UniProtKB/Swiss-Prot annotation:
This is Pentalenene synthase. NCBIfam families: PentlnSynPtlA. It comes from Streptomyces exfoliatus. GO terms for molecular function: metal ion binding; pentalenene synthase activity. Changing F73A: Loss of activity. Changing D77E: 50-fold decrease in activity. 9-fold increase in Km for FPP. Changing W286F: 4-fold decrease in activity. 2-fold decrease in catalytic efficiency.
Length: 289
């Protein structure tokens, strides 16, 4: 599926290691129990993914992203059954996990939940408060959507799987890992927001053509396709990136506009290249077909 993402692909020089100790965390958290589930997990190349979403994270930082990614797919597995077919139900879990953004949870709490909590802890630990509060809301929306999606008892779809995809939490993570924050003043910008929306959509599209042969065979008929549709999807991605660049260029000017500091300007730059860009190129540098 030849696309048009005029952006350099990166991988964190540490992944070497990372991908090797990747099981450690989840096994201890109870997310992986049988030697089979560990294998299953390895075949997913989640550490390999995180390493592409966070080229700038080396070791202790990279590891976290590996987990977030790692946790992402495990968590999803929990809704592949009939639970993903009844909103009331999914939310029963949703809140147990999401409760971690409020404070410690009773041991009684499932592992998938204790798992998320440990990620959060380390993720939000060391960032400004205003940030965690934001980075959290985002998570909140992620969770919210899994329910709204479970409301299954064209563009209408995006709004739906716009929060479910979980792209933002990932992007957020780039900052978590990169030990830096985009000047909050700009992350709210009409431009940056526009840039982010794209990152999402692009991912939300690439994914749909890869997990197609699977979703086409089974039920789930919400996938963006349901050979021509493929085209205006390959096309849509083109224009999406094509514009991404246009936006990217207005960035410096956006700097003036928000009287951006002598060093906030550098911070934002990190965001463009290490958070928003990667999250796009990386998704692509993963698939096959």
């Amino acid at each position: 599926v030849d696309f048009h993402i005029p952006l350099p692909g990166r991988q964190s020089p540490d992944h070497a290691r990372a991908e090797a100790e990747q099981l450690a965390w989840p096994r201890s958290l109870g997310l992986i129990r049988s030697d089979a589930a560990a294998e299953r997990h390895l075949r997913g190349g989640y550490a390999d993914l995180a390493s592409r979403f966070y080229p700038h994270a080396t070791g202790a930082d990279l590891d976290l992203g590996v987990d977030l990614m790692s946790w992402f797919f495990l968590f999803d597995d929990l809704f592949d059954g009939p639970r993903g077919e009844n909103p009331e139900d999914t939310k029963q879990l949703t809140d147990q996990v999401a409760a971690a953004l409020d404070g410690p949870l009773p041991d009684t709490a499932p592992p998938i939940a204790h798992g998320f909590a440990d990620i959060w802890r380390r993720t939000c630990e060391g960032m400004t408060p205003a940030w965690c509060a934001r980075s959290a809301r985002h998570w909140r929306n992620y969770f919210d959507g899994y329910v709204d999606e479970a409301e299954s008892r064209a563009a209408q779809y995006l709004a739906m799987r716009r929060h479910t995809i979980g792209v933002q939490p990932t992007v957020d993570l780039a900052e978590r890992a990169g030990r830096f924050e985009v000047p909050h003043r700009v992350f709210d910008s009409a431009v940056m927001s526009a840039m982010l929306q794209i990152a999402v959509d692009v991912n939300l599209l690439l994914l749909d053509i890869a997990s197609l042969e699977k979703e086409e065979a089974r039920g789930e008929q919400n996938n963006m396709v349901m050979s021509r549709s493929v085209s205006h999807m390959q096309n849509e991605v083109r224009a999406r990136l094509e514009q991404y660049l246009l936006l990217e260029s207005c960035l410096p000017k956006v700097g003036e506009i928000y009287q951006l500091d002598t060093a906030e300007r550098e911070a934002l730059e990190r965001y463009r290249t290490d958070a928003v860009r990667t999250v796009i190129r990386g998704s692509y540098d993963w698939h096959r077909s």
